[PDB]
Amino acid sequence: NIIVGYGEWPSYCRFYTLDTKLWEKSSKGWYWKFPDVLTETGVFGQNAQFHYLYRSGFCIHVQCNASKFHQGALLVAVLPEYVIGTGADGFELQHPYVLDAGIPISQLTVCPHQWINLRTNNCATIIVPYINALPFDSALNHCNFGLLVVPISPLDYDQGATPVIPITITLAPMCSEF
Amino acid sequence: NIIVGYGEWPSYCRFYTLDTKLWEKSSKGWYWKFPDVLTETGVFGQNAQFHYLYRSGFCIHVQCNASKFHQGALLVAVLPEYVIGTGADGFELQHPYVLDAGIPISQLTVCPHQWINLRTNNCATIIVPYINALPFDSALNHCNFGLLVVPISPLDYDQGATPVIPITITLAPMCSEF
Amino acid sequence: GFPTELKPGTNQFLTTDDGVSAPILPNFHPTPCIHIPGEVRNLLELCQVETILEVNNVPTNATSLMERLRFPVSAQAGKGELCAVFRADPGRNGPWQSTLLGQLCGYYTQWSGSLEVTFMFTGSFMATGKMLIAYTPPGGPLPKDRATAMLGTHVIWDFGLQSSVTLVIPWISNTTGLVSIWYQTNYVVPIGAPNTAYIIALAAAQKNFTMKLCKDASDILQT
Amino acid sequence: GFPTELKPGTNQFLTTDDGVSAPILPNFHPTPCIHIPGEVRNLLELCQVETILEVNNVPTNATSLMERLRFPVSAQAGKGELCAVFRADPGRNGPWQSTLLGQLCGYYTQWSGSLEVTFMFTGSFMATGKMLIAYTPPGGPLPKDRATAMLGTHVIWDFGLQSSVTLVIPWISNTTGLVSIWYQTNYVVPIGAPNTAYIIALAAAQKNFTMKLCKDASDILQT
Amino acid sequence: GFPTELKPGTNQFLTTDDGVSAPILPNFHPTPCIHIPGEVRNLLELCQV
Amino acid sequence: STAETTLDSFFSRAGLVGEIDLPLKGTTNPNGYANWDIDITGYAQMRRKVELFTYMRFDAEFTFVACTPTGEVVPQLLQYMFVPPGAPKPDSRESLAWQTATNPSVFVKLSDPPAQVSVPFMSPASAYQWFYDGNMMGTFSVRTVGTSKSKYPLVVRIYMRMKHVRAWIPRPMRNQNYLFKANPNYAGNSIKPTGTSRTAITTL
Amino acid sequence: STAETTLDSFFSRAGLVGEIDLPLKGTTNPNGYANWDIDITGYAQMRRKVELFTYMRFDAEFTFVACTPTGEVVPQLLQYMFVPPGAPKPDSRESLAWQTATNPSVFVKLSDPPAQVSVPFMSPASAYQWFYDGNMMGTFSVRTVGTSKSKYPLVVRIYMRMKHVRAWIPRPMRNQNYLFKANPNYAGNSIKPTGTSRTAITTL
């Protein structure tokens, strides 16, 4: 289904398909930062570094295609001002239990989130409004939020099946202002 | 054009043409004091020293005639209670930068003022009401205000042209009381 | 000339007193407040949000810490065999310490209301089976077998029909109730599918939950 | 018999406190106020008055201090050559320290609004030419040549057509914007007229300028 | 229980202060005033003589 | 009736933040003055409570309690000057910042009820934020009035209460021990579970 | 909302103007009294602020803080007599001006909150003027009550706040250093620019 973050639609004051992540049997999780992930891509990327003040919402779709003989579960969530403690390809979580920042993953469902169960569905949509303490900020020095994709239940299959599952992320800016 | 000092016309509670100042290439500026400048002149001069209480407004015209091949700019301003720090012919400024009183000339445009640009105009008119903390004062012991004419841009010309430019001041008392 | 009396509580500083002081900076204008989404005014809104319950809080290694978020259901376990058991105590030490409800009720002294637990099956699409989830009221012992647990509050969960089931726990306060999961049938799976799966449990609070008498009570060090 | 409590802020003297004291001379009648022209009730009225901007703050001799009020435009400078450049920072050290706006905003801590700069040409009536005045927003570098500055916010100023031009600077706050002046054409003049002229710059503030958090901050000694 | 503040001009005696004190002899009745001619209420009346 | 779980009730009590020593002789403060930057984390339990949210907005209320190390009360006068953000701080007892009229002061005696003042919301933005992927409130300066040193040792304790509390965007609560100030850094070589453990999943 | 730039806000805080020493032994004041003529320029920053205008009209509010040089509080009584303009001033401790009923006095103790009084607009004209091409407010006399000398050294500090401020005819702000009081004289052999300088007009 489609969830709207904090029950607010983006307002005023195309599709971009990134590369594919390969979910494995020993994967830990990945994260992306916004709007850093879209700063070197296309007209949005040019406007981000060719202006001074930036303000935009977003719409994120996460999909994965797997057979009926695979199993596993993923948690997709959005965390504003995601500072990390101890590009368009993201990073890998070193200690997924503490979310790499000293906070538990079991309480990550307090943020706008969705579940992907391979036996039930294969899609997740999140709509994020603009969150800041100021009406405008800098697109090259401040990261508004981060996106997390963590496998809570490990991927499993039988020998002879495809050992990697593709996870594709496609996103579209909404109500962008420069 | 004509400006009215502080947006007030003189109220109740002839023309006098002084001598001509010769603007030169090395001139610094001149000033006159009121009503000292008109105390030895005519019926006004007799009434000033033959009475006890005095109260009057003024209307000041400053003109200069020069050719189309001359250049320069003057600032004309009126400063009430112009005390000097370190007649009808005025004095000469020794340190025009500090207005001879320790205050900058760049902020002199906060007073009733006019500009004379030789390429644009040749006249400036200022109307001064009566300013004092008492309804009447003494005409021989208190100077109400002073008039300044300072060249911000130096006078320039080519060799063979007239090297001195005449500046004539004509003033007329308004709503005078004795 | 107005007479006064100066009662016996005069020059005292009570830290819980509420009053008005002298502003140190009058004529100062603070920044006007813009609209920021996601405003929370009461903590019960946070208490009513489902979070992961670590029923399987057995392992303690650094690299095995993620195994505490689910418990297995295998094909080598027979019918009628106990799978997992836990209490229904949000404010005490145990599985509930991982949920936001337990952490938030660790800041108070008394609480009462109703809870709910949600189980999610993350096996393959071709696996089938049945489970029995039972609830025992306070003061009773753990049932000795599946048949004894059947004579009571219980639900039968079918993997093929449903992927999630919910269990509303009636009133709790301040012994505590027990939740146990039994095998009804065996784990049926075709050829070519994994023999083991995992279950994820989510817990939250209902709309009649309340807390009282705030404490501070924490053991995380500033520096 | 009226009870009182004597709260914990009782016998204290706060210098920013506002109250009513006991008049030392009752029955005394102060002099009634007559009308005096030129009353000012707010400082923004003074901030909105144009004053001379010392763009040419190079010389420091006692007798060369009047040269800081204008900068030259000569006939020996080619086309496309940079004339002068300055920032748009009223509250910081530099050319703006000579304007009343800078001096008045040196008494506060924060400010924001729009500005405007006026240039006046004081050459002869027979001189002609063109200038380019450009504005660069915060975060950008100085344009490398006239062509680069043309692709942006700019105005073309003609000496023959006009004697004064104005440039509205958009929002500033608290890096800062830049203002640069380039030669578009050369300085054309007939025979019998001076080869050099001067430009006077005047700066002020618009009606949306505000200041906040007063400081005292001054370095002029009483005696 | 009424809170108070005790401002910084509290225990001071200003000789030009005007206020009300405690009468030392209540229940005492002063002599009523008869009419006496020649009452003066302002000094300018004396100045105008 | 569910009025003890509101944010105003959650942050509602005056707690001890900061303590200043003015010894007669020693090396702690050789002179008779000290500077204390305003922070809410002087209270040990405040950081984990405030970091449940991302943005906060509140006022403050400060109370100063002064006494001798033994607890005695002596005839001394103090200053308690407040330096707003963006203003210079004192450097000595003879500094000219102690008499700048734009820094409010509160002259008070030890043999008096504790002093009390209020501080408004002092941020350029619309709220404080504890996390910034990319919060100055002021300073309190404490000294003893006089041109000579005092005759007594003194201690000053500061209590702060927060009023008109608002918050946005809840976050997971802190799980591991802190290592620095304004830093989510954690000891990566010793990670502990969120709670206690048991022997087996089938045993209570 | 643009209410911090009003004249009342511009002149709105109590600043230290004047200080009186009454030593036990020495040569500063051999007797137990001193005379302080009221002026607003005792505050260092006041002159350049007030001289932005030509005419001013306001009331005043004075506060007296007294203590020992070390800062101690002692059992002493003081007088604080006010001499209006046009009246004779004390010459000694036995002078008869100390008990003239037309000079108001404020008897107070050191172990008391600071004394506070108000002074109205005392000029024959309609406003004070800082420049006159051609301003007495009063005097405060401070002594220790008694026919014998006091047993303690004392210091008195006076703070003044201006109320109901009005002004006329703005002027350029002061540019050079002052040399005298009530004199626009400046050092003519050392004239400095209004601000800082740079190397060239084409370089930032």
From TrEMBL, chain E:
Record localization: Host cytoplasmic vesicle membrane; Host nucleus; Virion
Family: Belongs to the picornaviruses polyprotein family.
Function according to Swiss-Prot or TrEMBL: Viral protein genome-linked: acts as a primer for viral RNA replication and remains covalently bound to viral genomic RNA. VPg is uridylylated prior to priming replication into VPg-pUpU. The oriI viral genomic sequence may act as a template for this. The VPg-pUpU is then used as primer on the genomic RNA poly(A) by the RNA-dependent RNA polymerase to replicate the viral genome.
Description of how the protein assembles with itself and partners: Interacts with capsid protein VP0 and capsid protein VP1 to form heterotrimeric protomers. Five protomers subsequently associate to form pentamers which serve as building blocks for the capsid. Interacts with capsid protein VP4 in the mature capsid. Interacts with protein 2C; this interaction may be important for virion morphogenesis. Homohexamer; forms a hexameric ring structure with 6-fold symmetry characteristic of AAA+ ATPases. Interacts (via N-terminus) with host RTN3 (via reticulon domain); this interaction is important for viral replication. Interacts with capsid protein VP3; this interaction may be important for virion morphogenesis.
UniProt protein name: Genome polyprotein
Organism annotation: Human enterovirus 71
Shown chain mapped onto the complete sequence: 324 to 372 of 2193
